[PDB]
């Protein structure tokens, strides 16, 4: 079924007036929020 | 694999992550009991 979900709006005049750029706005919500995989490791021989 | 193999050929695994030097010292124990032995001839490791 349908759900309600959260929306963010993201003022450009703001960010322009506090010299905050849009594409750091972006990258900061996603991995903050979103999470990213970043690069792997070994644990007992196997790379996770 | 059919004209020049008349040895038998076999692969010993580390099934759970205890190092390479593990699996050498095993390597290791496996060829020198190997050497007393009678009816086995020239066995050696195969590789480096």
Excluded: C
């Excluded at chain 1, 709006?9 to 322009?16: E, L």
């Excluded at chain 1, 905050?20 to 970043?38: D, F, H, K, L, P």
């Excluded at chain 2, 009678?38 to 490791?45: D, E, Y």
């Amino acid at each position: 079924e349908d759900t309600p979900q959260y929306q963010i709006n993201v003022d450009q005049a703001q960010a322009g007036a506090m010299g905050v750029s849009i594409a750091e706005i972006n990258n900061t919500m996603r991995i903050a929020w979103g999470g990213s995989y970043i690069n792997d490791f070994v644990d007992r021989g196997r790379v996770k | 694999e059919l004209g020049v193999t008349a040895g038998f050929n076999l692969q010993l695994k580390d099934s759970s992550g205890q190092g390479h030097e593990k699996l050498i010292a095993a390597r290791n124990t496996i060829l020198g009991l190997a050497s007393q032995d009678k009816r086995l001839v020239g066995v050696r490791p195969n590789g480096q």
